Amino acid sequence: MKALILVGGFGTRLRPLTLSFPKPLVDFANKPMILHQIEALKAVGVDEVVLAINYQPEVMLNFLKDFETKLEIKITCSQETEPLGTAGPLALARDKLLDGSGEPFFVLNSDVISEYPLKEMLEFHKSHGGEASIMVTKVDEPSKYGVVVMEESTGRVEKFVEKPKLYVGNKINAGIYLLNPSVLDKIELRPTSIEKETFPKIAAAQGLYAMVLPGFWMDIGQPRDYITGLRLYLDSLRKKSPAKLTSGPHIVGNVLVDETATIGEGCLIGPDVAIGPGCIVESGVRLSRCTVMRGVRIKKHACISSSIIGWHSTVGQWARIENMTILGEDVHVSDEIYSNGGVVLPHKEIKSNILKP
């Protein structure tokens, strides 16, 4: 069983984190986003996963080598010259997706975090015998998305309404696709969109079916939705496997701590914090609604809220970091510095206060 992961560009919207490692390798909940998906794809019997990227994948060849051996799965890159959209890459890598068994293949948005009911979706797709199945999830602002209009008694999709000024529903594209090989005959090797060009073709032939996604969903493509997705994901661990969440008198809410991380005495971590491997959180540190990536040090008495601290960064003593601050890799914030939404490029030294760029 084959699978495709739609990456596209390196991800400007996640700068400066993506300036060091492209979008599918940025950490989410102590794991690179690629792991969350491949672990899920492997659990349904996927043996090869094609990565549809826009950048040169040589920058991530050393990481994927190790991930292929540990996860026992084939990862093949499929780079595009010009941006082919979300359906275009399906044609560019049609040779790597067709294996002759006529079996359907999975397609995933590289920035979608969920519980991935891929087993439950396999049985859904084979029941109605349609050409393509997509996952659907409900949101609060469907006017900002393309809303699905589906025959809810059967699941058959009639049409997609892009950015409806008037309410026609609240179910949107959840980014999880299950497509038969025949779909690849409806996509030319040009920039085409699967939701606005390919799906209407299948929606006309009455071969498009939608399955409501049971569980949380979030596209962490941008920083605001990244923090939101971390909260929804951590509460999923609270509901599913609470043993993975940490606990103690210094813990409020749901906190995920890597076993190789150091937590100093007298801290207060939470709610909704993810601390990565090799992190040194010194004594008396306040952390909430933030992500601390691999190898960053938070010196004593610092307070961090609603922020993302890039790999191997260093927050000085009594520093104040809040309001959607994003430190890149290897950023050294000095003591007592105040960041109100600072966006610091990698390897920089922050010696004075910074605000929103």
From Swiss-Prot:
InterPro entries in UniProt: GMPPB_C, GMPPB_N, Mannose-1P_guanyltransferase, NTP_transferase_dom, Nucleotide-diphossugar_trans
Residues involved in diphosphate binding: G9, G11, T12, R13, K23
Subcellular location: Cytoplasm; Nucleus
Enzyme Commission no: 2.7.7.13
UniProt main location, coarse: cytoplasm
Summary of subunit composition and partner proteins: Interacts in vitro with CSN5A and CSN5B, but in planta only with CSN5B, which targets CYT1 for degradation in the dark by the 26S proteasome. Forms homodimers in the unliganded structure. The product-bound structure is composed of six dimers that form a dodecameric assembly.
One example of a Gene Ontology biological process annotation: response to ozone
Record annotation: effect of changing G11S: In hsn1; reduced enzyme activity, ascorbate concentrations and N-glycosylation, and increased sensitivity to ammonium
Residues reported to bind GDP-alpha-D-mannose: L6, V7, G85, N109, D111, G146, N173
Gene Ontology CC, one term: nucleus
SUPFAM superfamilies: Nucleotide-diphospho-sugar transferases
Knockout consequences: Embryo defective arrested at the cotyledon stage. Deficient in N-glycosylation, altered in cytokinesis and cell wall architecture during embryogenesis. Mutants vtc1 and hsn1 with reduced enzyme activity show reduced root length and leaf cell size, reduced accumulation of ascorbate, increased sensitivity to ozone, UV-B and oxidative stresses, increased levels of abscisic acid (ABA), salicylic acid (SA) and resistance to virulent pathogens and root growth inhibition in the presence of NH(4)(+).
Name of the molecule in the record: Mannose-1-phosphate guanylyltransferase 1
Keyword Nucleotide-binding: yes
